[PDB]
Structures are given as C-alpha cells and as structure tokens.
Design a protein around this nucleic acid. Structure first.
Ligand SMILES: Cc1cc2c(cc1C)N(C[C@H](O)[C@H](O)[C@H](O)COP(=O)(O)OP(=O)(O)OC[C@H]1O[C@@H](n3cnc4c(N)ncnc43)[C@H](O)[C@@H]1O)c1[nH]c(=O)[nH]c(=O)c1N2
Length: 460
DNA sequence: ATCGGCTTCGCGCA
DNA sequence: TTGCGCGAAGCCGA
C-alpha cells in the first residue's frame, strides 16, 4: 500500500482476469520502483502473477553503441534480478503502439501499468495503446520524488518559484520504499542476439580515432543496478562532503557521476535523496546537491510536460525570443558547421577540450556543459541552428542524452528558459554570457585542456 | 499590491 | 587562485 497521488488512470476500465503487466520504459530497475511496486500490489489483490514487458524501439539507431550497450547490459542484469522474485521478463522488439497492445491480447493481461515520461514520443505511444486495449491502463511516477503532475499544475518560470512548491510536498512524499514481494503465482527473443544485432547495425557509424580504434572508453561507468549503487555509495563517502565547493571545477572528479544511471532508471533518485538526507556531511554540500537532483531535475520534467515544443525556439520565454530576434543579423565572429563542432575544430582549445571529453567519456562535466552550449549559440549562424547542433551532439554523445534534463538544460543555456536576462551583448542578446576568462578565475583551464590534449590530432 | 530576489554571469580589486 | 561588491537585466509573486 503506497501514496495514490503517484498514480494516474489512463484508460478507465473494468478489471481483466490475467496477469498485471508492467510496461517498463523509463525506470529500468527492480528495487525502488513505485511502478513495479504498485503492479505487484494489484497483482496480489487479484491473485494473479505480475510480469514485466519491455519494448526495444528502433530509436537506438539515432544514438551510438555507447548508449545501446550501457542499457542492453543493464537489461541483462535486471533480467536475472527479476527472475529471482519469480517475475518473468518479456522483451518485445518493435513499435510500442502496435507491439504492447498486441502483447496485452496474446497474454490476456488483467490491467496495464507504465512509468512516467514527459517526452513527446512516449505520450504518442500511450494514446495508441489506449485506443487498442480493453483493460484499464495505469501510470505511475517512479522517476520523480514528488509526482510531476502533483508538484505544480503549470509551467514554472524559475527554480525559486518551483522550490517552495516542491519543498512543502517533500515531507509527504520523501518516504522509504517497501519490499518487492516475489511472485507467488508462477506463470506460463533473447537479449544476447539483440545486443549482437544492434551492435552490428551501429558499427558503420562508430566514432573512431585515426588509428581505427574507437573513441569511447567504456570503463568510466559500469552499467547496472548493482554498479549504480556502488557509485551512489562512493559519492556519499568520498565526494559529497566537498560537492558544493568543487561542483564547478572540471579538474576535480567531485560530481556524483549518477546521471547515466538515473537516466536509464538503473537507480531511483528517491533512494539517493533518502541516503543523502540521513548522511552526515557539509550542510552547504547537501543543500547544493539536493537542489540539483530535486529542484533542477524535477523542474526539467516540469518543462517538457507543460511545453510540448520543449526542443524548439518557441519554448523560450517571451523576453528571450525578443532578444535573439533582435540580434539575428549581427555578424558572428565565427561560424562553424555541425561536424566542425563535432570534431573539436574551433579556435577555442577549452571548447574543443570539452567536446573531447564528450566523445571519449560520454559524460561532459556539468559546468563545461553550460559553457559548451553557450559558445555554440555564439559561433552558429542562427538561434535555430545552435539549438539543432547542440541537441544533436548532446543526444548523440551523452550517456544521459535523450532526457528532459538535456532539453531543459539546453533551453536554459541558449534560450534562457528558467533563467533571467543579463546585460545585452551582440549576437547572444540578453542571454547569460560565460567567458573563457570566467573559467580561469574558477579553475586551472590549462589542466582541463591538458587532459584531453592530444585527442584532436589523434582523432582527425 | 510594488518592491525584493533570482543556478553565483563577468570582471575590478584587493 | 579567491571572496566581495557592483552592473545590467525581466519578471513572479507575496
Ligand atoms: C547544455 C547542457 C546539456 C545537458 C545538461 C545541462 C546543460 C547545461 N544536463 C544537466 C547536467 O549537466 C547533468 O544532469 C549533470 O552534469 C550530470 O552529471 P552528475 O550526475 O555527475 O551531476 P551532479 O552530481 O552535479 O548532479 C546530480 C544530479 O542533479 C541533476 N542535475 C544537475 N544539474 C542539472 C541540470 N542543470 N538540469 C537538470 N538536472 C540537473 C541530474 O539528475 C544529476 O545527475 C543533462 N543532464 C542529463 O541528465 N542529461 C543530458 O542529456 C543533459 N545535457
């Protein structure tokens, strides 16, 4: 039994006789999952087993092997984890609107549950699934602490507007997780080949170095529920105490390193928050970190949920479009094309340094993300093209890419969504400016450049 | 209300 | 480096 404001009736309906079916999507984990926890609870009152069903869409050919393997190795571990609680896992392979709604038929499912994403394509799928199922259809926010549609019913203009609203809801929703009770009813293709198949598809596209070896180094983030925990734990032990004072230094590995895990659902951020809240470190440090994993993460959901064009110019706030529109004819000092950005071929060795961190590691430092996308706007031929170029490089190369945090962060950087207006520059209007020189007062830039020094020539 | 306060940007200056 | 103030800037919301 759990908080019901975590649930939303999609298709009002009458209960079916068969298994309760969890259509997993965003939250790829067995522990700390309110979606799976609710489907087990309604599975228990109907005395049916609960099964999980995952769909593998052809969206993987938009990304690279790095994302596809991180997740495929992640699913492979969950699969063993679900089986131990007697919950079988089914892996469909196609377009969900057709595939889920015909799984529901072939399987006589009693009722249907999914997790919550604000991305446009998921909602498109749901309404397809809804039109073609008889059984009721339930939705659970397992990704935010406070449910997106409960935190605030409108678009939030800034962190300080949303921050009260979220924090007066924290006592009621920041609670611990119960246990996933294993199935008691035991019930009636393979992830190996699907990985081999998908890798073969993506190989022609891999990002190589001149010497025909790949760029991406797969050893900075082991994928999986197990590996994620040892990251959250090492963070609370080694880094959190100094997080607030070094969050902004791209030479200190002092971030949480959590975002590939949170993105794929491999760890609950509600578990993190519990574990930070009880953990005993710098009060300033906890407050800075909680503002990121709580306020900034869950507002980025608030962004895409209430702004369908979250990845377009029209989503920017009224003043910001006015400013960029005023400066559309200004002569840019430089203009680069996508693949020149991609290949680290700017005049700015600090900018190429971080492009190099993105290519080789799959995670750009969070301070260097704000700079990277501001310099794209400043050296691209138009607002729209900057956006386009930045999303394409983010989602193609970030492990945490294709995520509401990506868009709301790109919108923040380029269009100022969730930000204020600043002193008026040429080209970038009133958009918050960051300078190379700003980064020199904050951290030894020569060390950052030095680290990824000798990848540009080695991968030209 | 109508005036403070805002992811803490950048750069002077000590 | 590293705080601390000051400048330029639009608007939510109490
Ligand atoms: C241009 C640009 C591009 C991106 C992003 C921001 C910007 C400015 N972000 C957000 C942020 O850069 C990223 O979430 C963290 O750096 C991920 O690293 P850590 O988890 O180590 O962060 P860290 O430990 O500092 O923070 C912990 C968590 O806080 C959240 N968080 C931090 N900064 C945030 C931000 N500005 N917006 C939203 N949530 C935030 C994340 O969930 C993050 O994992 C993003 N994030 C992401 O998950 N996927 C993406 O594709 C992108 N892309």
């Amino acid at each position: 039994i759990m908080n019901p404001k975590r649930i939303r009736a999609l298709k009002s309906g009458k209960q079916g006789d068969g298994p309760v079916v969890y259509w997993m999507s965003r939250d790829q984990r067995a522990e700390d999952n309110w979606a799976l926890l609710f489907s087990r609870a309604i599975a228990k009152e109907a005395n049916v087993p609960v099964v999980v069903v995952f769909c593998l869409t052809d969206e993987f050919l938009e990304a690279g092997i790095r994302q596809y393997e991180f997740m495929l190795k992640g699913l492979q571990e969950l699969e063993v984890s679900l089986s131990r609680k007697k919950i079988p896992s089914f892996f469909l392979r196609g377009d969900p609107g057709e595939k889920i709604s015909r799984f529901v038929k072939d399987y006589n499912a009693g009722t249907l549950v999914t997790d919550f994403s604000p991305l446009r394509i998921k909602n498109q799928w749901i309404e397809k699934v809804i039109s073609g199922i008889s059984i009721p259809f339930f939705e659970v926010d397992a990704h935010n602490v406070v449910p997106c549609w409960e935190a605030s019913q409108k678009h939030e203009y800034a962190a300080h507007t949303f921050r009260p609203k979220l924090y007066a809801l924290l006592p009621e929703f920041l609670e611990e997780f119960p246990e996933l009770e294993p199935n008691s009813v035991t019930p009636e293709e393979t992830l190996s080949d699907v990985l081999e198949t998908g890798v073969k598809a993506l190989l022609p596209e891999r990002a190589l170095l001149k010497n025909k070896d790949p760029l991406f180094e797969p050893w900075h983030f082991e994928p999986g529920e197990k590996a994620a925990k040892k990251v959250m734990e090492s963070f609370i032990a080694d880094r959190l105490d100094s997080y607030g004072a070094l969050r902004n230094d791209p030479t200190k590995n002092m971030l949480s390193n959590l975002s590939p895990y949170l993105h794929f659902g491999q760890i609950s951020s509600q578990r993190v928050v519990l574990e930070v809240e009880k953990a005993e470190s710098n009060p300033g440090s906890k407050k800075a970190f909680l503002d990121e994993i709580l306020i900034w993460k869950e507002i980025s959901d608030n962004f895409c949920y209430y702004n369908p064009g979250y990845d377009g110019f029209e989503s920017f706030p009224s003043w910001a479009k006015e400013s960029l529109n005023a400066h559309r004819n200004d002569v840019r000092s430089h203009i680069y094309t996508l693949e020149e950005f991609e290949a680290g071929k700017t005049h700015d060795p600090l900018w190429n340094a971080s492009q190099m961190e993105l290519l080789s590691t799959g995670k750009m430092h969070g301070y260097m993300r704000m700079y990277w996308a501001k310099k794209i706007l400043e050296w691209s031929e138009s607002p729209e093209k900057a956006l386009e170029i930045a999303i394409c490089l983010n989602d193609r190369y970030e492990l945490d890419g294709r995520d509401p945090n990506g868009y709301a962060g790109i919108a923040w950087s380029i269009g100022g969504v969730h930000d204020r207006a600043w002193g008026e520059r040429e080209v970038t209007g009133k958009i918050r400016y960051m300078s190379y020189e700003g980064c020199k007062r904050k951290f030894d830039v020569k060390l950052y450049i030095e680290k990824y020094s000798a990848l540009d020539k080695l991968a030209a």
